[PDB]
Amino acid sequence: TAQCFLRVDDESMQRFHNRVRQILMASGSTTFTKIVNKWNTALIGLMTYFREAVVNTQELLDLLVKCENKIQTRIKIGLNSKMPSRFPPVVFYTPKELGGLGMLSMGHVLIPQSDLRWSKQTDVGITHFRSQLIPNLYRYIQPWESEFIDSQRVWAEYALKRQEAIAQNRRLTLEDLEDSWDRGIPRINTLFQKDRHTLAYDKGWRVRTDFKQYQVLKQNPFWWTHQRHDGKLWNLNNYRTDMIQALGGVEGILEHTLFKGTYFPTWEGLFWEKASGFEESMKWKKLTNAQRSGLNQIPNRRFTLWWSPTINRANVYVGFQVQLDL
């Protein structure tokens, strides 16, 4: 009988843009990983709150791509004072645990066909192999209408099953209700938490979380839900795996890195040692601000060295070659 068209309020758009502006300005002497984490948090909050309205809104997509490009330009400026051309996207979009920044994308980024080739040498000789668009969040996020209808349906299912279980004197097992694991606005997952009995006495939690803004300085993007009561309303393991595959499989990603230089026989039993440096990372001490800034730059040094092979080429930077002394 009627149709409801949705959009994101211009006020919310402006708030998100100002959040990105604050991230950039306060970036200052901070780290690339922290900048990317702030961007990921902001984007996840916006995209999980305004699910369909973002797609319906033709200005918010442009704003999102503009802010993402600004963030990428900040990273590149930090990398070097001269703007390159056709910078590779692997460094930005590679998962954190694999040496990348683990950036979350919301635009239409086309990976050049060139970057996906990778070589491998063994006793036989050298063999060359190949493997597309970066996955977008909107596909992996689920629409609110579907969420609501499926929630009604699944909770009716649970009511029926629970009545049957009380008839049988038993408790509902994880084996039953299994097909309904992640479904329901109050997620079925929350039904198995240890502290459910304690949480049963928590009231006004939503308004309390909303009001927290007057007590805690930090901005909470998830000011409208609590992981404890509503459960986790999204899931991105699929997105991470598809990001790896689109970037071209683990070998394709590692081709750009220095991993082959380390000469490790395989990439299985390796592990990063975060925040160690040459001085044990000297995390606790009474050092001066300049010294602390140097330590905070050390991780950027490790990242730049790690991705140097794909960053240190004439295609990326126009030719002004200078041989390193000796």
Partner 1 sequence: SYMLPHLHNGWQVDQAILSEEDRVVVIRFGHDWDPTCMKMDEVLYSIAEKVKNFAVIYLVDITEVPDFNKMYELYDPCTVMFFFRNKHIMIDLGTGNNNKINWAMEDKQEMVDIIETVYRGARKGRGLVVSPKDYSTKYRY
Partner 2 sequence: DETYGVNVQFESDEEEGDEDVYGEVREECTLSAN
Partner 3 sequence: PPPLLVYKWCQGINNLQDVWETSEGECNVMLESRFEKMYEKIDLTLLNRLLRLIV
Cα 5 to Cα 26, 55, 140, 217, 306: the distances in Å are 37, 11, 22, 35, 48
82 contacts 317 by C-beta, under 8 angstroms: yes
* In the complex, least distance from residue 165 CB atom to partner 2, rounded to whole angstroms: 8
When the beta carbons of 136 and 293 are compared against partner 1, the nearer one is: 293
Instruction: Give the whole-angstrom CA distance, residue 172 versus residue 159.
Output: 11
Q: How many CB atoms lie within 10 A of CB 150?
A: 15
171 contacts 164 by C-beta, under 8 angstroms: no
When the beta carbons of 162 and 302 are compared against partner 2, the nearer one is: 162
Instruction: Give the whole-angstrom CA distance, residue 223 versus residue 229.
Output: 13
Residue 74 binding partner 1, by CB under 8 A: yes
Tell me which stretch binds partner 1 (CB under 8 A): 18-26, 133-141, 248-256, 312-320: 18-26
Tell me which stretch binds partner 2 (CB under 8 A): 79-87, 170-178, 213-221, 256-264: 170-178
* Binder of residue 293, out of partner 2, partner 1, partner 3, none (CB less than 5 to 8 A by kind): partner 1
* Binder of residue 1, out of partner 1, partner 3, partner 2, none (CB less than 5 to 8 A by kind): partner 3
Taking CB under 8 A as the rule, which mask of x and - marks residues 21-40 in contact with partner 2?
Answer: --------------------
Tokens of 306: 């790690």
Cα 145 to Cα 7, 50, 52, 148, 157: the distances in Å are 15, 12, 9, 5, 18
Closest CA to 61 of 141, 142, 140, 136: 136
46 contacts 16 by C-beta, under 8 angstroms: yes
128 secondary structure, DSSP code: E
Tell me which stretch binds partner 1 (CB under 8 A): 20-28, 105-113, 117-125, 230-238: 20-28
* In the complex, least distance from residue 29 CB atom to partner 3, rounded to whole angstroms: 37
State residue 63 phi and psi, 5-degree precision: -60, -40
36 contacts 71 by C-beta, under 8 angstroms: yes
* Binder of residue 74, out of partner 2, partner 3, partner 1, none (CB less than 5 to 8 A by kind): partner 1
Counting residues that bind partner 2 (by CB under 8 A) gives 14
In the region spanning residues 78 to 97, those forming contacts with partner 1, defined by CB under 8 A, are: 81
* Binder of residue 4, out of partner 1, partner 3, partner 2, none (CB less than 5 to 8 A by kind): partner 3
Instruction: Give the whole-angstrom CA distance, residue 259 versus residue 269.
Output: 13
Residue 293 binding partner 1, by CB under 8 A: yes
When the beta carbons of 149 and 287 are compared against partner 1, the nearer one is: 287
Residue 282 binding partner 1, by CB under 8 A: no
In the region spanning residues 98 to 157, those forming contacts with partner 2, defined by CB under 8 A, are: none
Instruction: Give the whole-angstrom CA distance, residue 92 versus residue 134.
Output: 11
* In the complex, least distance from residue 161 CB atom to partner 3, rounded to whole angstroms: 23
Counting residues that bind partner 1 (by CB under 8 A) gives 15
The residues that touch partner 2, with contacts defined as CB under 8 A, are 162, 165, 171-175, 177, 191-194, 196-197
The residues that touch partner 1, with contacts defined as CB under 8 A, are 21, 24-25, 27-29, 74, 77, 81, 288-291, 293-294
